[PDB]
């Protein structure tokens, strides 16, 4: 099964085997998908906006350049997974088990990671300006290139993260060290 | 009163008044100013080795090219004071107060500042390798270009002191960020 350039709006999905459907440019706009089995699914260029995947399974999944604008992840099974160019505004994905998940070049704006689990995950040059870090775990995360608010590294746990020079800068001002040159 | 290219070895001074007293060139090894009245002095290219300046007052005065080595200061009245250029290696700082204190292009190696208040003091360019900090106030001190092993920044109140880039990036890693 094979949707292409097509929409999906306030669809109840509950439950249903969505196992192995690819998309291609579809939108689906406040769709119900808790508990749904999306394994080994495969994404080009679609959009989930303010869709809830609550309890849902997405592993072994394929999403390259799509949107998951507002989309709830709460207990979803997601990894393993790959994430190409997406874009999560918004997505709450607390509490969610993303340990070396690849999510670099990822929008990740205003993202809920609360107690996320991001252990080893590769978030390079990804933007996480506003999103919301408390008891995050990025322990040896790659965070090279990935623009974070100042309130990150106070925030998130971040021992044995791979960081850069400007980040490190950042780092240390975020501490309330006052950084001249 | 004058002292000058002399050395005193042994000697008690103890509770002896010598405020105000200029030395030049003077070595005093293992010599005892506990609670002695040093202010006002001035010391230029003098030595005071493994003495002991325990409950003196050295308070106004000046300090220029000496040597502290080993020398305890333990609950000396010491600020306000100038040091310049000043080698404090192995002397005992502990609990001193020394905020607001210039030790700029000083050699602070392997002191004791365990509990010592440097807030807002002035440490541009400084040697503090080896040092103990353990419970040290460094709050809003000026540590810029000074020298500091990686633990310093684990070990020192730091926050709002004055750091350069290289300070910066130490900061991360001891911290446990792996910093490329």
Do not use: M
Not at 75 to 101: H, K, Q, S, Y
Not at 154 to 164: E, H, L, M, S
Request: charged residues 30%.
């Amino acid at each position: 099964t094979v949707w292409a350039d097509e929409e999906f709006a306030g669809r109840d999905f509950r439950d249903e085997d969505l196992s192995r459907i690819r998309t291609e440019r579809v939108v689906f706009t406040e769709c119900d998908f808790s508990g749904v089995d999306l394994s080994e699914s495969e994404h080009h260029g679609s959009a989930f906006r303010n869709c809830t995947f609550r309890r849902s399974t997405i592993w072994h999944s394929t999403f390259t350049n799509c949107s998951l604008l507002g989309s709830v992840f709460t207990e979803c099974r997601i990894r393993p997974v790959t994430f190409v160019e997406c874009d999560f505004t918004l997505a709450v994905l607390g509490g969610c088990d993303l340990r070396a998940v690849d999510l670099s070049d990822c929008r990740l704006r205003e993202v809920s990671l609360v107690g996320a689990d991001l252990r080893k995950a590769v978030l390079r040059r990804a933007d996480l300006t506003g999103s919301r870090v408390q008891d995050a775990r990025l322990e040896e995360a790659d965070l090279r290139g990935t623009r974070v608010d100042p309130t990150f590294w106070t925030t998130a746990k971040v021992r044995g993260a791979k960081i850069d020079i400007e980040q490190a800068l950042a780092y240390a001002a975020a501490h309330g060290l006052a950084v001249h040159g």
